[PDB]
């Protein structure tokens, strides 16, 4: 029961997917650094090669093509528009984007760019990161290239993907690139990633852009007990991992408490920040639950190869508190949501994934569930495409629609794949 003219489309990621690390000039980013280090990969991998998708894109827009999606959600490597993250652009960097968005374009996809899918060129990184508010204003101006380059092309755009996760796990805990450990000491890194967002959204629309938005981690935070210790730090967390990232662009302020711990002119930040947007763009994977707080699996669910829940009513729960808290919220579109199962092709090359598809037709449900509820969501991207590098767990979690084989780089589409096809033109 989805909406008439619901976009379907599905995702990747330019470090996840493309490979070609050194080739046409591309600089290094802090996932090359990350992942060039002893213990941080799970399996010992990078994205040196992975689906090698900076060589074999054309089979891969075949791929979507066959499929029929509305949409294609990818992301701009920067270190390939410039290598250090500043200066003049790389012109095979702006070669490669420029003829993949012609090719979406003959095959009737409407391309969605994402600007930064937390590949930081690591020149940018030494000179301080996201701690420098210098960062954010190199972003203006990569975006004001890609909007120069683009503009009148691309369908949508998401500057920033998953800034909470940029943000605690990148420069909190350290888990991910670029390996920080800050605590608390992150938040500035919050309101650069922020700033950088508004800023790029400026740049865009003076490009020329169509629909900006963005692509945000959402998750209901579940109390694990009834202890205030764990109410407060569900509260907490929800405050930190949801409301730091929406408040400031949908309502143009920071969760109590927050603003007087960011730096710089805060509340002259928060106009940049706010920037009308033509769709909020989220990645729901399932609810967090929590117990200054610890983040552990909500009990009572199945979970996924990845060891997470799978539970599409926090999908509708979440859409529906999402338009409780912010009224005027523009259309929302689902950047991503998909799953880890692990089942690659049998004996006679058939990748039956039927948890994946068990997982993907719930959350379609949950998406209309809320639709219903007169929650006004506009479209869904699955991620991903493709089996591809998962950050610190390497090629140990498969989340496409089509496998990939990593040592021969074959694609085998996937049952997920048909039975994704097969709804999309149901629903046309
Ligand atoms: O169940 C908890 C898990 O849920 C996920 O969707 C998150 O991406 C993980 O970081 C988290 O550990
Ligand atoms: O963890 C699975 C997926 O989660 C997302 O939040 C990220 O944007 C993807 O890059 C990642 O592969």
Request: proline content about 10%; some cysteine; glycine content about 16%.
């Given at each position: 029961g989805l909406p008439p003219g619901f976009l379907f489309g599905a995702s990747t990621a330019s470090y996840q997917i493309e490979?070609?690390?050194?080739?046409?000039?591309r600089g290094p980013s802090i996932w090359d650094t990350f992942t060039a280090?002893?213990?941080?990969?799970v399996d010992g991998?990078?994205?040196?090669?992975?689906?090698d998708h900076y060589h074999r894109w054309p089979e891969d827009v075949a791929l979507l093509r066959r499929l029929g999606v509305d949409g294609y959600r990818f992301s701009i490597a920067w270190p390939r528009i410039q290598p250090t993250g500043?200066?003049?652009?790389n012109q095979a960097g702006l070669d490669f984007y420029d003829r993949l968005v012609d090719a979406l374009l003959e095959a009737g996809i409407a391309p969605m760019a994402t600007?930064?899918?937390?590949?930081?060129?690591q020149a940018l990184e030494d000179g301080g990161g996201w701690l420098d508010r210098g960062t954010a204003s190199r972003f203006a101006e990569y975006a004001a290239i890609m909007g120069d380059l683009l503009g009148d092309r691309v369908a949508h755009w998401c500057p920033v993907n998953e800034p909470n996760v940029v943000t605690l796990?990148?420069?909190?805990?350290?888990?991910?690139?670029?390996?920080?450990?800050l605590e608390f000491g992150a938040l500035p890194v919050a309101h650069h990633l922020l700033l950088g967002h508004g800023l790029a959204v400026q740049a865009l629309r003076a490009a020329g852009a169509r629909q900006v938005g963005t692509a945000t981690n959402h998750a209901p935070v579940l109390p694990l007990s009834g202890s205030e210790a764990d109410v407060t730090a569900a509260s907490l967390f929800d405050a930190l991992w949801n409301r730091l990232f929406a408040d400031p662009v949908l309502l143009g302020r920071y969760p109590d408490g927050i603003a007087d711990a960011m730096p710089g002119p805060v509340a002259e930040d928060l106009l940049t920040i706010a920037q009308p947007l033509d769709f909020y763009g989220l990645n729901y994977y399932n609810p967090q639950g929590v117990r200054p707080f610890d983040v552990a699996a909500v009990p009572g669910y199945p979970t996924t190869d990845f060891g997470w829940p799978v539970a599409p009513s926090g999908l509708t729960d979440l859409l529906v508190e999402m338009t409780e808290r912010y009224?005027?919220?523009?259309p929302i579109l689902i950047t991503e949501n998909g799953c880890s199962y692990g089942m690659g092709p049998d004996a006679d090359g058939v990748v039956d994934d039927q948890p994946r598809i068990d997982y993907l037709d719930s959350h379609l449900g949950a998406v209309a569930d809320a639709v219903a509820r007169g929650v006004d969501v506009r479209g869904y991207y699955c991620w991903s495409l493709l089996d591809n590098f998962?950050?610190?767990?390497?090629?140990?979690?498969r989340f496409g629609l089509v496998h990939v084989?990593?040592?021969?780089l074959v694609r085998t589409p996937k049952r997920s794949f048909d039975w994704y096809a097969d709804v999309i033109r149901a629903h046309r």
């Open positions: 490979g070609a690390t050194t080739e046409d000039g280090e002893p213990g941080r990969v991998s990078s994205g040196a090669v992975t689906c500043s200066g003049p652009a600007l930064y899918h937390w590949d930081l060129p796990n990148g420069y909190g805990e350290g888990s991910l690139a670029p390996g920080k450990a009224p005027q919220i523009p998962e950050w610190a767990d390497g090629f140990t979690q084989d990593y040592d021969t």
